[PDB]
Amino acid sequence: AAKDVKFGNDARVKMLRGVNVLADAVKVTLGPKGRNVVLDKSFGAPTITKDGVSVAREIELEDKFENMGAQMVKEVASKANDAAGDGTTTATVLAQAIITEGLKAVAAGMNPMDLKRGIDKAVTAAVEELKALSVPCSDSKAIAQVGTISANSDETVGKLIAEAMDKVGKEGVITVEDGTGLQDELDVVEGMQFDRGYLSPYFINKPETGAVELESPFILLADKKISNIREMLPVLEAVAKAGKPLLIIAEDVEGEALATLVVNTMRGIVKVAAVKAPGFGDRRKAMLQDIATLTGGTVISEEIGMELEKATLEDLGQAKRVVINKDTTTIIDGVGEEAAIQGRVAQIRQQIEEATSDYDREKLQERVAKLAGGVAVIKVGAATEVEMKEKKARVEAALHATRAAVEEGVVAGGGVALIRVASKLADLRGQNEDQNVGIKVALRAMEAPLRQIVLNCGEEPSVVANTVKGGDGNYGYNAATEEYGNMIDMGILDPTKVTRSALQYAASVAGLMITTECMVTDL
Amino acid sequence: AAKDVKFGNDARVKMLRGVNVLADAVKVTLGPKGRNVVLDKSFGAPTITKDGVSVAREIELEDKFENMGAQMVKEVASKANDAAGDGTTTATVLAQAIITEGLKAVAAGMNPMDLKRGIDKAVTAAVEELKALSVPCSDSKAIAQVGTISANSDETVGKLIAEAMDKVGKEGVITVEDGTGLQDELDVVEGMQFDRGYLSPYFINKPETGAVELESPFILLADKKISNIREMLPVLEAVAKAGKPLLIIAEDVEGEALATLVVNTMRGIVKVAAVKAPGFGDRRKAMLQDIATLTGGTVISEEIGMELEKATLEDLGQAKRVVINKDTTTIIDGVGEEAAIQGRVAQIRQQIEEATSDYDREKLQERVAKLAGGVAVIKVGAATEVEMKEKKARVEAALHATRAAVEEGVVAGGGVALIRVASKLADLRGQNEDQNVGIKVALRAMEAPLRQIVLNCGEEPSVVANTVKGGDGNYGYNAATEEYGNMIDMGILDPTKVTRSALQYAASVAGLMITTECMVTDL
Amino acid sequence: AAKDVKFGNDARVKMLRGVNVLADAVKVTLGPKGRNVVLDKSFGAPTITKDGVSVAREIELEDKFENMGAQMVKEVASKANDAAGDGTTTATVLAQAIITEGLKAVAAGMNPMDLKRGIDKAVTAAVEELKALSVPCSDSKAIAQVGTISANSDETVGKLIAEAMDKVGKEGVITVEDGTGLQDELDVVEGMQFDRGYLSPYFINKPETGAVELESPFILLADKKISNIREMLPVLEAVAKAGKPLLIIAEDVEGEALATLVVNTMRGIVKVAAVKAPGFGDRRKAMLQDIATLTGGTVISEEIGMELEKATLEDLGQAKRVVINKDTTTIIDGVGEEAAIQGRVAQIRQQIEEATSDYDREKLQERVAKLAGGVAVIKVGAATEVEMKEKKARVEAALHATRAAVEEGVVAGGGVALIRVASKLADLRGQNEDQNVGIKVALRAMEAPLRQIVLNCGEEPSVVANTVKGGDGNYGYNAATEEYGNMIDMGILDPTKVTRSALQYAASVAGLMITTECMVTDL
Ligand SMILES: Nc1ncnc2c1ncn2[C@@H]1O[C@H](COP(=O)(O)OP(=O)(O)OP(=O)(O)O)[C@@H](O)[C@H]1O
Ligand SMILES: Nc1ncnc2c1ncn2[C@@H]1O[C@H](COP(=O)(O)OP(=O)(O)OP(=O)(O)O)[C@@H](O)[C@H]1O
Ligand SMILES: Nc1ncnc2c1ncn2[C@@H]1O[C@H](COP(=O)(O)OP(=O)(O)OP(=O)(O)O)[C@@H](O)[C@H]1O
Ligand SMILES: [Mg+2]
Ligand SMILES: [Mg+2]
Ligand SMILES: [Mg+2]
């Protein structure tokens, strides 16, 4: 079953109360003045983390309708999180701001659909304007700063990510592991990364992220593509011994060879993942060799024409870790000696001398980049296990945000980017008055992030907001030092990606909420 | 179990209260001014859809008798929905209007049976009069408009359906799929559609609609009719490999061949559907070939006399999708090359030159139409999964209504058609006064839809109603612009089919409700 | 599920109340004036032990939030206990002191993060300063005193530990067993200890401490490394007879031999642990022989080149007890005669005469130390089983603390060390006022231990504190005699390790607690 059915105003006030409890609990957290949130545990000491996200996860309300409103806006943070891995609190205060004024306009008699249309138009133009302002990333200091800011005042994690990207760039892979010990640790181990993915998706390992991950696995470099089981038999058994995954790098991922791997790892003997030698055609064989040289068992190549059968137990290689993902196959560390690797480099280096053309030159540079690009490993600091798991989360998000920042650039942080955008949209209008109110609702909500940051400092939101709007460009308020200045020069940046995402998800959920004619729930 | 038994007036007031709660919740929704309904979910954010239907599904009342009244009238929307796929809200306000005045007349002492007879007579004549007024559909713009109107202000879905029907007409099949991505998408893939249905009803797949649906299935064109298992063995095994359905298009659906398909797909090996080559006799073989040319493996024909055995692995064909239904067998996309297809066209095109007669000419044109008629695919827009599933529903209904409109035409929308009909019946009378009151009850209820649309706009129902009744023809009120004008010229049309259905189901359930001498329910 | 969510001050007062109940219950206990705590049992008489730890284990509160605060600070004692095995009560009063003033500062409006930073800085410098003051241990009387003090006024246990360490030093192993009878017991049985650990981490026995323990096991000294099963067959069967564990001491722990032991003890026949002959290379064989001479079956050596097969049933040796751990393999008691042992000593003693060099001299001395170093066994006094199990705990902790004291020295007890450290940090400052308050909070809490000890005596904390701070160095208050004096001269010492640990864990948990923006718990 029997349902309770309402109609009219009574659903709106319920929703609003529910989003307010959630947003108010979450938004404090934001702003350096407030610090941490505690999250209760059934056993032992509570968790202390400054996660807006950590706070949101705990919010559930008694009133069924208020709880619905809270769970709905909670979707904002989660989507912003999944998409950018940062800015969930910012997204939550933007949503509350849009929902609050939007529902007030509805109560005033304004058309919900028009309000939503206006909000949408403002967000569409705001995003374009955000792209126009955003400017790209810089060297490791800037990367560290952005990372720190995106991790909420962990400058350590910020530096780590910046250094890791300085080593491998985007190209290498960057990974995060629990720390070997209680320090933030950043080290480049020989990542060779080449562009497959796995085959049968059924190779997916623990990483729910749609990847696979092997630790100290063995690496069969079938250089030729694998003809026979026979050729595999020796390596498959070496991998049969437990804890040693096997990674098959044959000329392409086979039928024959692949089919066997799928069946064997299907029966629990020798878990195993397969990927092609990189590229196509000729370069494929040359690349399959670069992997051999890196993982130490240098297989007599496909280029040579020698087979997997040629490939042997010597052929098998090994690395502390290998991941095969959306990106690639990435081998982290490698048996292959630097001697062999650096020697291989010298070879290809002459190839470029000999090579008549640019094409051969391009193809060679592609190989050196893959084989030398390497990989950067971020170990979250540790001791105790709780703090270690927490810092790991921050490093993960900070990395994600910084990566985005590097691609298309970051914008002034401290909520000033959205304020500059809002001021540029002062003349934006819609098809009618109600749509115009919706536009204004959105532009007003764009000041909320800066205002909450200031409020958390113990300062006056309107005064600081008024002063920032007074200047222009990167002029903003540094909440850490409580001084005005050039946000970029002070190193307070936000990846354009997280700002954009926070705004779009906030407007999206807000738009939905806005129109509720009738509500139905269990009695 | 022990029952509670009432009698007399007390059942009527209960029913009326129950239909009022349901109808009032539903009818707001209707009218552009009101927007969406929210439907609560046990997990996550509520659903926002503007579905009268969505609202009705949630309505259940505490008082057992009131709940009975609500569940009864709820049958109106569901039947109108099943029959026309649109107009459920319109049907619900017509029912409430008829039930309300009808029960009042009963309370006044009027004979229930006569009241029902009068209502029935008015509806019978009204439907005839509705047919007299209705006028047929037009080109893609009109189709888009009607579709939009039938989808409640989704002009996008309206355009899609209109374009899809412009491509294949009625003849081709039109289908709807979840969008590949988050856009309304409309594309014609080579539908060849021929008239069967499936040899065994036990071939129905998941589509509860009594159709079976295969994705990228293999197509055996047994041109000759299939003699042997032997001939099937090769194709059956190719289909044995999983995910590839098999579609058997042999000269007719067999015994021999059919029986095998029924047994094999019965054991989970090679799921499989069979249909005849189209038509009978000679044309059958020629048509079975058109399918071959379309699905790419051109089987040596029955016309030739070559067999299924002649037919091979080359013979097997393939298409992204095939549906076998009430309509036909429809192959969407096809392996068969345009080269082959267009060449086949040229052949038959000369056949028409050579052909002595009209008969041969007709038969040939039938084949080109089937092979060229093609098929239109409507992809509801996507991102996120919720909105995507919703828009898909709207496109489905809009399509259904527009299809009906194209067949026998549409009538002025905005509730004006029923108002014109009602005015034409002002002199209608029955066998007695009570029957006359029933007639008047029905004619009065016919104004309800226009009045509710206006009420939802925030305007005055009586004033607008009075003004529309004042003019005539397609003169009506445009609720979107709040201007009077020619409904047809403004593109506000309703398929005559949904209007007729809404009225008949409303009168039908209303008639039933009207007479309740005694009521029995569980204690 | 549903959660209750609070925010603001209300979490802090709850936490504080919870830590106060726990700390107040625990801190009495500390100080000689108060004696014991009773712990209720479901059956029989209550347990009487003076364990702060015993009291903490029983603390659970009704109010869910207060209980959380109690369980959180309870983590302080447990970690200090795991790390130093003493000073849990001291750690608890330091935590209460830091938490109390820290939360007061927060309520006053001070920045939690800065408060925590200040506390952390003070603790970091305090620990450095603690190292500067600490001074190393001395002969058995001093060891006894420190042990007694660390065991809370069991001078008996103190003497035992001191004597045990005087026998074997650190080098020998010291162990604790339930008393054979109701006395503090203390005896050196021939421990020969060398550094392995176990070949397989699946040899771990009852001892949860990550060790193995065998009673009267048989000792196979495979001097040569074990080639064959054949060689093992005789000894494996002798060990097959039950209750006699087998310890394999072959040239190294094998593959061949090791693999067999893992499989056999895996099937419940002959439980068995394997360890290498000590060292590498040549010295390995010589050392493997020292074990033979000690466990009585002197195996024809690896040095000789004779094999396990050479080794026989005579070869097998036996000892009341053997433990294989983090430290080593340690054989306690031995079949091997003193005749053989002392004779072996004479041999190696001449080796030193002959030996040309220092290297050979060093290697030989290493062997005599291992073979003669011996082992000290501490039997907690007994009758009745309850008291016996209790005294055993005290001896274990006292031993642990005294061992730490011997390594890097002890500091003045009675809480004076922390008071001296605090006075040396009077000018320590941070980045801002809030950080300065945090520093002061920590320095103030450092007086808490001495103040509680005095309070438990029935004296005035402020007066005694004031007087101790008045003097300097090891000047302190002897709570047993209620006289001031030189803490070291009076034998009141604390291992620097327990003092350091108590302070760090107290500050660590206190720091966490301090910042709670919001709290979430089950309804
Ligand atoms: N010194 C500073 N002055 C002003 N604003 C700052 C400063 N440091 C960081 N910020 C801003 O705070 C926001 C990022 O903090 P945080 O990561 O806590 O927010 P969030 O990402 O929304 O919350 P969460 O990380 O839990 O999702 C950004 O807009 C950032 O620019
Ligand atoms: N611009 C307009 N002016 C007047 N009436 C309009 C306008 N647009 C649509 N309508 C009318 O609204 C009705 C269709 O809307 P809707 O689909 O919401 O009603 P419904 O089909 O009864 O509800 P549901 O689709 O949930 O069953 C039609 O009678 C249509 O002509
Ligand atoms: N004669 C004494 N005068 C002053 N203080 C003393 C005296 N004897 C012991 N103490 C002090 O009491 C403390 C050790 O006692 P105790 O072991 O009870 O404390 P605890 O280790 O914190 O509690 P628990 O052992 O249950 O963890 C030390 O700081 C020690 O120096
Ligand atoms: Mg963040
Ligand atoms: Mg409709
Ligand atoms: Mg103690």
- Can the peptide bond before residue B384 be classed as cis, meaning omega within 30 degrees of 0? yes
SS3 category, A224:
coil
Q: Whole-angstrom Cα distance, residue C165 to residue C401?
A: 12
The dihedral formed by the CA atoms of C16, C21, C24 and C25, expressed in degrees to the nearest 10: -150
The total of other beta-carbon atoms located within 10 Å of residue A485's CB is 15
Residue C502 and residue C78 in contact, taking contact as beta carbons nearer than 8 Å: no
Q: Whole-angstrom Cα distance, residue C462 to residue C452?
A: 10
Alpha helices (H) along A203-276: 229-240, 256-264
Closest CA to C288 of C243, C254, C260: C254
| DSSP symbols for C293-336 | HHHS--PPPTTTT--TTT--TTT-EE-SEEEESSS-EEEES-SS
Give C519 to chain A, closest Cα distance, Å.
Answer: 6
The total of other beta-carbon atoms located within 10 Å of residue B238's CB is 15
Q: Whole-angstrom Cα distance, residue C317 to residue C335?
A: 6
Check CB contact of C108 with chain A, cutoff 8 Å.
Answer: no
CB contact under 8 A, C516 and A36: yes
The total of other beta-carbon atoms located within 10 Å of residue B334's CB is 27
List all residues 6 or more positions away from A44 whose beta carbon is below 8 Å from its beta carbon.
C71, C72, C75
- CB contacts of A518 in chain B (<8 Å) are 25, 28-29, 37-38, 55, 58
CB distance C479 to ligand 3 below 6 Å: yes
Amino acid, single-letter form, for residue C323: V
- B422 carries a ligand binding annotation: no
- How many Å lie between the centroid of ligand 6 and the Cα of residue C204? 29
The dihedral formed by the CA atoms of C41, C45, C48 and C53, expressed in degrees to the nearest 10: -10
| DSSP symbols for A313-349 | TTT-EE-SEEEESSS-EEEES-SS-HHHHHHHHHHHH
Phi and psi torsions of C512, nearest 5°: -65, -50
CB distance A494 to ligand 1 below 6 Å: yes
Q: Whole-angstrom Cα distance, residue C33 to residue C15?
A: 29
Look at the block and give the residue holding tokens 């209720």. C40
Residue B95 and residue B123 in contact, taking contact as beta carbons nearer than 8 Å: no
Q: Enter the tokens of residue C193.
A: 């200890």
Residue A14 and residue A63 in contact, taking contact as beta carbons nearer than 8 Å: yes
Distance, first Cα to last Cα, chain B: 8
- What's the Cα-to-Cα distance from B294 to each of A452, B344, B348, rounded to whole Å? 64, 9, 14
SS3 category, B21:
helix
Question: B438, exposed or middle or buried, with CB in 10 Å at 0-12, 13-18, 19+?
Answer: buried
Resolution of the experimentally solved model in angstroms: 8.5
Residue C46 and residue C40 in contact, taking contact as beta carbons nearer than 8 Å: yes
Q: Whole-angstrom Cα distance, residue A308 to residue A299?
A: 8
Q: Whole-angstrom Cα distance, residue B479 to residue C443?
A: 77
Q: Enter the tokens of residue C50.
A: 């003076």
The total of other beta-carbon atoms located within 10 Å of residue C444's CB is 15
Q: Alpha-carbon Rg of chain C, whole angstroms?
A: 27
Sign of CA dihedral A121, A122, A123, A126: positive
Residue C102 and residue C441 in contact, taking contact as beta carbons nearer than 8 Å: yes
Q: Whole-angstrom Cα distance, residue A452 to residue B172?
A: 59
Q: Whole-angstrom Cα distance, residue C450 to residue C469?
A: 11
SS3 category, C45:
coil
Amino acid, single-letter form, for residue B112: P
Q: Which atom from ligand 1 is nearest to the alpha carbon of A502?
A: 22
Q: Which atom from ligand 1 is nearest to the alpha carbon of A31?
A: 12
Closest CA to C41 of C360, C363, C385, C382: C385
Residue B288 and residue B249 in contact, taking contact as beta carbons nearer than 8 Å: yes
Residue C502 and residue C84 in contact, taking contact as beta carbons nearer than 8 Å: yes
Which-ligand-closest: CA of B481? Answer: 2
Question: B191, exposed or middle or buried, with CB in 10 Å at 0-12, 13-18, 19+?
Answer: buried
List all residues 6 or more positions away from B122 whose beta carbon is below 8 Å from its beta carbon.
B425, B428, B438, B439, B442, B443
Q: Whole-angstrom Cα distance, residue C211 to residue C328?
A: 10
Amino acid, single-letter form, for residue A402: T
List all residues 6 or more positions away from C197 whose beta carbon is below 8 Å from its beta carbon.
C275, C324, C325, C326, C328, C329
SS3 category, A403:
helix
CB contact under 8 A, A36 and C112: yes
Check CB contact of C75 with chain A, cutoff 8 Å.
Answer: yes
Q: Whole-angstrom Cα distance, residue A393 to residue A30?
A: 17
Q: Enter the tokens of residue C177.
A: 């067993």
CB contact under 8 A, B38 and A2: no
* Side-chain-facing half-sphere of C335: CA atoms under 13 Å: 18
Check CB contact of C71 with chain A, cutoff 8 Å.
Answer: yes
Amino acid, single-letter form, for residue C57: R
**What letters, b where the CB count within 10 A reaches 16 and e where it falls short, cover A278-312?**
bbeeebbbbbbbbbbbbbbbbbbbbbeeebbbbbe
C and B make contact (3+ CB pairs below 8 Å) = no
| DSSP symbols for B120-141 | HHHHHHHHHHHHHH-B---SHH
Task: Nearest by CB to A512, from B32, B45, B60: name it.
Answer: B45
Give A69 to chain B, closest Cα distance, Å.
Answer: 8
Closest CA to A487 of A468, A498, A474: A474
Q: Whole-angstrom Cα distance, residue B128 to residue B121?
A: 11
Which-ligand-closest: CA of C482? Answer: 3
Q: Whole-angstrom Cα distance, residue A394 to residue A390?
A: 7
Helix, strand, coil share of chain B (percent; to 5) = 50, 15, 35
- Going by the DSSP 8-state scheme, the letter that residue B440 receives in this structure is H
Check CB contact of A453 with chain B, cutoff 8 Å.
Answer: no
If one residue of C29, C54, C90, C477 were mutated to test the ligand 3 pocket, choosing by the most ligand atoms within 8 A of its CB, it would be C90
The total of other beta-carbon atoms located within 10 Å of residue B2's CB is 5
Q: Whole-angstrom Cα distance, residue B479 to residue B487?
A: 11
CB distance A413 to ligand 1 below 6 Å: yes
Residues facing B518 on adjacent strands: B7
List all residues 6 or more positions away from C252 whose beta carbon is below 8 Å from its beta carbon.
C225, C276, C277, C284
SS3 category, B69:
helix
H or E element that contains B52: helix B52-58
Task: Tell me whether strands A37-39 and A47-49 are parallel, antiparallel or unpaired.
Answer: antiparallel
Task: Tell me whether strands B47-49 and C185-189 are parallel, antiparallel or unpaired.
Answer: unpaired
Q: Which atom from ligand 2 is nearest to the alpha carbon of B478?
A: 3
Closest CA to C133 of C485, C411, C497, C494: C411
Residue C478 and residue C485 in contact, taking contact as beta carbons nearer than 8 Å: yes
CB distance A334 to ligand 1 below 6 Å: no
CB distance C53 to ligand 3 below 6 Å: yes
SS3 category, C446:
coil
Q: Which atom from ligand 2 is nearest to the alpha carbon of B88?
A: 27
If one residue of B22, B48, B152, B496 were mutated to test the ligand 2 pocket, choosing by the most ligand atoms within 8 A of its CB, it would be B152
Q: Whole-angstrom Cα distance, residue A155 to residue C309?
A: 64
H or E element that contains C56: helix C52-58
- How many Å lie between the centroid of ligand 1 and the Cα of residue A19? 21
* Side-chain-facing half-sphere of A220: CA atoms under 13 Å: 39
Q: Return the ∠ at Cα C434 (arms to C433 and C439), rounded to 5°.
A: 95
Residue C191 and residue C173 in contact, taking contact as beta carbons nearer than 8 Å: yes
Residue C56 and residue C92 in contact, taking contact as beta carbons nearer than 8 Å: yes
Task: Nearest by CB to A36, from C5, C517, C523: name it.
Answer: C517
Partners for B (CB, 8 Å, 3+ pairs)?
Answer: A
- Can the peptide bond before residue C384 be classed as cis, meaning omega within 30 degrees of 0? yes
Residue B316 and residue B220 in contact, taking contact as beta carbons nearer than 8 Å: yes
Residue B92 and residue B27 in contact, taking contact as beta carbons nearer than 8 Å: yes
Task: Nearest by CB to C75, from A44, A58, A60: name it.
Answer: A44
Q: Whole-angstrom Cα distance, residue B484 to residue A290?
A: 77
Residue C7 and residue C512 in contact, taking contact as beta carbons nearer than 8 Å: no
Task: Nearest by CB to C111, from A21, A33, A43: name it.
Answer: A33
- CB contacts of A455 in chain C (<8 Å) are none
Q: Which atom from ligand 1 is nearest to the alpha carbon of A29?
A: 18
Q: Enter the tokens of residue C434.
A: 């809030």
- What's the Cα-to-Cα distance from C58 to each of C25, C71, C151, rounded to whole Å? 10, 11, 21
Task: Tell me whether strands B375-380 and B173-178 are parallel, antiparallel or unpaired.
Answer: parallel
Look at the block and give the residue holding tokens 């919001």. C518
Closest CA to A293 of A315, A309, A278, A312: A315
Residue nearest to atom 6 of ligand 1 (CA): A414
Which experimental method was this entry solved with?
cryo-EM
Sign of CA dihedral B314, B320, B325, B326: negative
Question: A125, exposed or middle or buried, with CB in 10 Å at 0-12, 13-18, 19+?
Answer: middle
List all residues 6 or more positions away from C23 whose beta carbon is below 8 Å from its beta carbon.
C73, C92, C93, C95, C96
Residue C210 and residue C325 in contact, taking contact as beta carbons nearer than 8 Å: yes
| DSSP symbols for A411-468 | EETTTHHHHHHHHHTTT---SSHHHHHHHHHHHHHTTHHHHHHHHHHTS-HHHHHHHH
The total of other beta-carbon atoms located within 10 Å of residue A13's CB is 14
Residue A147 and residue A161 in contact, taking contact as beta carbons nearer than 8 Å: yes
| DSSP symbols for A19-60 | HHHHHHHHHHHSSTTS--EEE--SSSSPEEE--HHHHHHH--
H or E element that contains C490: none
Residue C76 and residue C89 in contact, taking contact as beta carbons nearer than 8 Å: no
Give B301 to chain A, closest Cα distance, Å.
Answer: 36
Q: Whole-angstrom Cα distance, residue B36 to residue B89?
A: 13
Check CB contact of B482 with chain A, cutoff 8 Å.
Answer: no
List all residues 6 or more positions away from C208 whose beta carbon is below 8 Å from its beta carbon.
none
Check CB contact of A11 with chain B, cutoff 8 Å.
Answer: yes
| DSSP symbols for A453-489 | HHHHHTS-HHHHHHHHHHS-TTEEEETTTTEEEETTT
The total of other beta-carbon atoms located within 10 Å of residue C75's CB is 17
Residue B302 and residue B288 in contact, taking contact as beta carbons nearer than 8 Å: yes
- How many Å lie between the centroid of ligand 4 and the Cα of residue A337? 41
Q: Return the ∠ at Cα A362 (arms to A359 and A363), rounded to 5°.
A: 85
Q: Whole-angstrom Cα distance, residue C487 to residue C502?
A: 20
- Going by the DSSP 8-state scheme, the letter that residue C135 receives in this structure is B
CB contact under 8 A, B45 and A519: no
H or E element that contains B176: strand B173-178
- What's the Cα-to-Cα distance from A343 to each of A167, A298, A350, C464, rounded to whole Å? 21, 12, 11, 75
CB contact under 8 A, A517 and B34: yes
- How many Å lie between the centroid of ligand 6 and the Cα of residue A225? 68
Residues facing B178 on adjacent strands: B380
* Strands, E assignment, C367-409: 375-380
CB distance C154 to ligand 3 below 6 Å: no
* Strands, E assignment, B381-445: 410-412
Residue B193 and residue B330 in contact, taking contact as beta carbons nearer than 8 Å: yes
If one residue of A26, A30, A155 were mutated to test the ligand 1 pocket, choosing by the most ligand atoms within 8 A of its CB, it would be A30
Q: Whole-angstrom Cα distance, residue B70 to residue A503?
A: 42
> Which residues keep their CB under 5 angstroms from ion ligand 5?
B 86
The total of other beta-carbon atoms located within 10 Å of residue B60's CB is 17
Which-ligand-closest: CA of B91? Answer: 2
CB contact under 8 A, A59 and C7: no
Q: Which atom from ligand 1 is nearest to the alpha carbon of A498?
A: 21
- What's the Cα-to-Cα distance from B499 to each of B78, B85, B442, B466, B495, rounded to whole Å? 15, 11, 14, 21, 7
State CA C312 to chain mean position distance: 39
**What letters, b where the CB count within 10 A reaches 16 and e where it falls short, cover B274-304?**
bbbbbbeeebbbbbbbbbbbbbbbbbbbbbe
Residues facing A7 on adjacent strands: A518
Q: Enter the tokens of residue C443.
A: 């320095």
Closest CA to C334 of C471, C467, C188, C149: C188
- What's the Cα-to-Cα distance from B121 to each of B75, B134, B439, C145, rounded to whole Å? 22, 20, 7, 113
Check CB contact of A343 with chain C, cutoff 8 Å.
Answer: no
Closest CA to C257 of C328, C313, C309: C309
Q: Whole-angstrom Cα distance, residue B339 to residue B332?
A: 17
Binding-site annotation, residues of C for ATP: 29-32, 50, 86-90, 414, 478-480, 494
Q: Whole-angstrom Cα distance, residue C26 to residue C20?
A: 10
CB contact under 8 A, A517 and B55: yes
State CA B61 to chain mean position distance: 30
Residue nearest to atom 12 of ligand 3 (CA): C414
CB contact under 8 A, C68 and A40: yes
Residues facing A378 on adjacent strands: A176, A186
